[PDB]
Amino acid sequence: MEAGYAEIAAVQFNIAGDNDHKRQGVMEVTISNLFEGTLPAEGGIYDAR
């Protein structure tokens, strides 16, 4: 697969509800432990995802 060349023609602004946040987000923060070892703690706010 390849991503063809494209340009932005317009921008639409809207109020983002919780549904948009749930759909767009790639993970859910559950713990307050920032770091586990050198690598970021999984489920924290620095999760590599």
3-state SS, residue 35: strand
What is the binding site for other proteins (CB under 8 A)?
Answer: 1-17, 19-20, 23-26
Nearer to other proteins (CB atom), residue 23 or residue 28 = 23
Nearest-approach distance from CB 46 to other proteins, in angstroms: 16
Contact assessment for residue 43 and residue 31, using Cβ atoms and an 8 Å cutoff:
yes
CB of 49 to other proteins, least distance (A): 11
Looking at beta carbons only, is 21 or 37 nearer to other proteins?
21
CB 49 within 8 A of CB 24: no
